[PDB]
Amino acid sequence: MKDSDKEKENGKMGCWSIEHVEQYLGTDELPKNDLITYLQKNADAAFLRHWKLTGTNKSIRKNRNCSQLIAAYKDFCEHGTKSGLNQG
Protein backbone atom coordinates (compact mmCIF):
# COMPACT_ATOMS: atom_id res chain seq x y z
CA MET A 1 0.00 0.00 0.00
CA LYS A 2 0.83 3.75 0.00
CA ASP A 3 -1.52 5.66 2.42
CA SER A 4 -0.71 9.01 0.68
CA ASP A 5 -3.13 7.77 -2.10
CA LYS A 6 -5.99 9.30 0.02
CA GLU A 7 -5.27 12.55 -1.93
CA LYS A 8 -2.85 11.26 -4.69
CA GLU A 9 -5.17 8.44 -6.05
CA ASN A 10 -5.80 7.98 -9.82
CA GLY A 11 -9.21 8.33 -11.54
CA LYS A 12 -9.82 11.95 -10.54
CA MET A 13 -12.44 12.52 -13.23
CA GLY A 14 -14.14 15.77 -14.18
CA CYS A 15 -11.05 18.05 -14.13
CA TRP A 16 -12.23 19.90 -17.31
CA SER A 17 -11.10 23.18 -18.89
CA ILE A 18 -13.06 26.36 -17.92
CA GLU A 19 -14.16 26.96 -21.55
CA HIS A 20 -15.16 23.25 -21.85
CA VAL A 21 -17.47 23.79 -18.83
CA GLU A 22 -19.07 27.15 -19.85
CA GLN A 23 -19.45 26.54 -23.62
CA TYR A 24 -20.59 22.89 -23.38
CA LEU A 25 -22.83 23.41 -20.24
CA GLY A 26 -26.18 21.87 -21.31
CA THR A 27 -24.86 19.61 -24.17
CA ASP A 28 -24.52 15.77 -24.38
CA GLU A 29 -20.71 16.35 -24.03
CA LEU A 30 -20.92 18.37 -20.75
CA PRO A 31 -24.47 18.15 -19.20
CA LYS A 32 -25.20 20.64 -16.34
CA ASN A 33 -25.97 17.74 -13.93
CA ASP A 34 -22.38 16.31 -14.21
CA LEU A 35 -20.82 19.74 -13.36
CA ILE A 36 -23.14 19.90 -10.27
CA THR A 37 -22.14 16.26 -9.46
CA TYR A 38 -18.34 16.94 -9.60
CA LEU A 39 -18.80 19.98 -7.29
CA GLN A 40 -20.89 18.07 -4.63
CA LYS A 41 -18.45 15.10 -4.79
CA ASN A 42 -15.15 17.06 -4.46
CA ALA A 43 -16.18 20.28 -2.55
CA ASP A 44 -17.20 20.77 1.12
CA ALA A 45 -20.94 21.03 2.05
CA ALA A 46 -20.44 24.83 2.60
CA PHE A 47 -19.56 25.34 -1.12
CA LEU A 48 -22.79 23.70 -2.39
CA ARG A 49 -24.82 25.64 0.24
CA HIS A 50 -23.13 28.82 -1.18
CA TRP A 51 -24.08 27.99 -4.83
CA LYS A 52 -27.50 26.41 -3.84
CA LEU A 53 -26.26 23.01 -5.19
CA THR A 54 -27.03 21.50 -1.69
CA GLY A 55 -30.56 20.31 -2.79
CA THR A 56 -31.76 17.68 -5.35
CA ASN A 57 -29.85 17.81 -8.73
CA LYS A 58 -33.21 18.02 -10.61
CA SER A 59 -34.27 21.33 -8.94
CA ILE A 60 -30.60 22.45 -9.04
CA ARG A 61 -30.29 22.17 -12.91
CA LYS A 62 -33.82 23.76 -13.20
CA ASN A 63 -33.20 26.81 -10.84
CA ARG A 64 -29.37 27.17 -11.14
CA ASN A 65 -28.36 28.22 -14.68
CA CYS A 66 -24.96 27.85 -16.40
CA SER A 67 -23.75 31.16 -14.79
CA GLN A 68 -23.94 29.54 -11.29
CA LEU A 69 -22.08 26.39 -12.42
CA ILE A 70 -19.30 28.28 -14.36
CA ALA A 71 -18.54 30.76 -11.53
CA ALA A 72 -18.67 27.84 -9.02
CA TYR A 73 -16.23 25.61 -11.04
CA LYS A 74 -13.83 28.55 -11.65
CA ASP A 75 -13.76 29.70 -7.97
CA PHE A 76 -13.30 26.01 -6.97
CA CYS A 77 -10.14 25.44 -9.10
CA GLU A 78 -8.92 29.01 -8.24
CA HIS A 79 -9.56 28.25 -4.51
CA GLY A 80 -6.97 25.45 -4.85
CA THR A 81 -9.30 22.77 -3.51
CA LYS A 82 -8.28 20.02 -1.01
CA SER A 83 -10.15 17.33 -3.02
CA GLY A 84 -6.80 15.57 -3.71
CA LEU A 85 -6.05 17.70 -6.80
CA ASN A 86 -2.25 18.28 -6.31
CA GLN A 87 -3.03 18.75 -2.56
CA GLY A 88 -2.62 16.75 0.71
Side-chain angles (χ1 to χ4, degrees):
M1 61 175 294
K2 183 192 63 63
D3 63 87
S4 56
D5 74 294
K6 189 55 55 56
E7 343 78 77
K8 283 70 181 185
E9 67 284 90
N10 195 272
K12 309 306 284 293
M13 66 77 190
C15 182
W16 311 290
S17 303
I18 303 301
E19 296 187 286
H20 183 90
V21 167
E22 62 169 292
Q23 295 299 328
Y24 297 64
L25 263 180
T27 65
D28 300 279
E29 303 182 84
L30 205 288
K32 297 179 197 179
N33 189 91
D34 286 55
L35 197 292
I36 300 165
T37 299
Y38 176 90
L39 269 45
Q40 63 201 213
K41 290 185 63 59
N42 288 272
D44 306 89
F47 192 85
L48 299 317
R49 287 179 61 185
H50 175 249
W51 295 103
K52 294 279 82 65
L53 318 173
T54 181
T56 174
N57 282 30
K58 182 170 61 184
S59 181
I60 300 170
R61 59 181 289 188
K62 295 173 69 63
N63 286 270
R64 305 291 69 190
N65 298 90
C66 54
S67 308
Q68 296 301 148
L69 280 55
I70 307 164
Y73 187 83
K74 289 190 293 178
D75 282 290
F76 190 55
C77 303
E78 296 293 289
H79 179 236
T81 182
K82 302 182 59 170
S83 306
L85 304 178
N86 197 268
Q87 181 63 270

